[PDB]
Structures are given as structure tokens and as C-alpha cells.
Amino acid sequence: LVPVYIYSPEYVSMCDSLAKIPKRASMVHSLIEAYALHKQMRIVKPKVASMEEMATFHTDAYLQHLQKVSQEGEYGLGYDCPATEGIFDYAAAIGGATITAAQCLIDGMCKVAINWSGGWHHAKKDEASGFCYLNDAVLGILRLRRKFERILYVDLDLHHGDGVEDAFSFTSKVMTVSLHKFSPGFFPGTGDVSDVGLGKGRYYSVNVPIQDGIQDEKYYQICESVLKEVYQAFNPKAVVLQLGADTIAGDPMCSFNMTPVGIGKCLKYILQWQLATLILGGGGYNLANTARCWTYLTGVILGKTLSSEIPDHEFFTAYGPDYVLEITPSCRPDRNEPHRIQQILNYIKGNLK
């Protein structure tokens, strides 16, 4: 009944090695521990994914190439996803952790299982993309489908959850919902509100394009409106929730103007459904703020209010100069015009009935 927390020292050390987010996994874990939240969770060591498990989504040829590059030094590698030594073992660890979380849920060990180091939502069956070499979210959804008939995937990262959406574009058994920045030239370029899925999957992809500067109140109003409609229309049996913290004020992506409180309200709205829920991280490039966000959201999962004062711990100096948990929104414009948001929400509302 207690939430599962996917963690081991070797897993955190592996995750600390991704160059866009050095030490982020240790920062997240050590802040969670500084707030004593691990004592309220069941710690489960992640398994490493086998190539057989990875091949439930990724192609045989992509997995051969990933292994080759990982040993030696095409398929989306080189720029955002450099072809570097060890990438296959890193992929296998992250994929394995999300699979392990899903297995805990299908086994009934818990109703919430947390892998903050997962959420690599851009990777495609045969292409690395957007820092993502393996789509652990897809692998977790596929594992949940062993026991749960309909899976709802909700993606609150700043970026469109394109790889997950594409994986399930043609099916009605998985519904994907992404809220994201959508603007010319902004990665990955997809996910306008008219992106609804294909074939029998038509209307089983939902996309909410949002502009710079959104704040907690409006974001929650949007998310709540969409999720209420999705729940009633789709009746999910399990949820996979990607909580990339690159929406939070102070992120180098410098787009949205959110705080963890607003994301937390979205999370609580989903938790009220009392379904098996797999919690993932994702983006989040202000490392201390990402740790603040995911620690706060762990508290939300546990029903716990945390002290504003960051407890002393190994990474204390990263939390200066304020050393508090709350994040102050920046002073920038909210570029979301009310009547454009109305148009977006009304379109989605009609598509879901």
C-alpha cells in the first residue's frame, strides 16, 4: 500500500552520468532523503532491462546499433544524443527501472511506483531523439498492458511527448495526453491541438499547445479541464505520468513560469482516481529546482507537507541564496491569450465525446 520508490546506489550513479544533467539523480535522491521521505516508501532496486525487453518497442536493428556504438564509439545519434561509450548500459538501466516500477504495479505491490530518473519520452522505435536513447515510458506502458486493459499516459514535461504518442498513435487502448510548449522552431515541433492520432487511435491522442509564461493557476485550470474529460471518456485502468520539471521557473529552457505547486495540483487530481500510477521524471535542467520539484511532488504523493527550509545535506549550497523549497515565479509575460486557450479547450472537449 505504501508507494514504491525505485532506487539503488548503482542506479543513481549511472543516472548521474548523463551529461546534460550531471549529479541530478543524486540531488533528487538526497533531497528526498533529507526530508526523510524514503522512510515512508518501499525502496525497490531496479533491474537492468534485457535486449529482449527493450525489443518490445525498439527495433532489433536499432538495438544492435546502440550496442555497437556503446562498445566502439545514423539512428538519431550524434547531436542531442551523442554516440558515446556505455550508452547501451545506460539505456538498459533506465528502461529496466521503469519496467520494474510497472512490474510492481501489475503485481499489486503498490498503487504508486516512482522512477524519477525515467521519462525519456522522445525516443522512437528506431531513432534516438531529444536526449532520449530508449523510450522507457513506452516500455512501462507495454508492461502495464499485461494486466491493465486501458492505460492513460499524461505528459507534463515542457516538450511534446512525441515518442510515446507515436508509439500508440494507432491504438485505442492507450490514450496519450501532452501539455507542452508549441511554437515555431520549438522542439520537437509537433503536437498542435489538431494532432489527435490515427485510425482506430483517432481521438486517443490529446495535445494542449501552450505559449511562454504560463503560471500555476491557468495551467492547472487547463490540465484539470482536459483530465476530467479524458477520465470520463476513456475510463483508464492505469496511469503513467511524466513530470519533467523543465516547466518550472528558472529552468534554462526559459519558457513556462510554473512552480511545483501547480504541477502538484495536477498530480493530486490524478491521484484521486486511485488507479495504479507509474510516476516518471524527464526534463529539468535547473538541477536544484528539479530536485525541489520532485521532492515536493513526492510529498504530495505521501500526503505530507514539507518544511520551507531546505534541510542541511550534502548539496546544500546548490539551494542558495534562499535555501527554501518554494520557487518564486519570474516576472515575464503570460503569452497565452484567454480566447485562444478557450479555443484549444473547446476543440479537445468536442473530440472527447
Add this chain to the structure above:
Amino acid sequence: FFXX
């Protein structure tokens, strides 16, 4: 970055 490049890219994303």
C-alpha cells in the same frame, strides 16, 4: 539543444 542542437536540436532540443
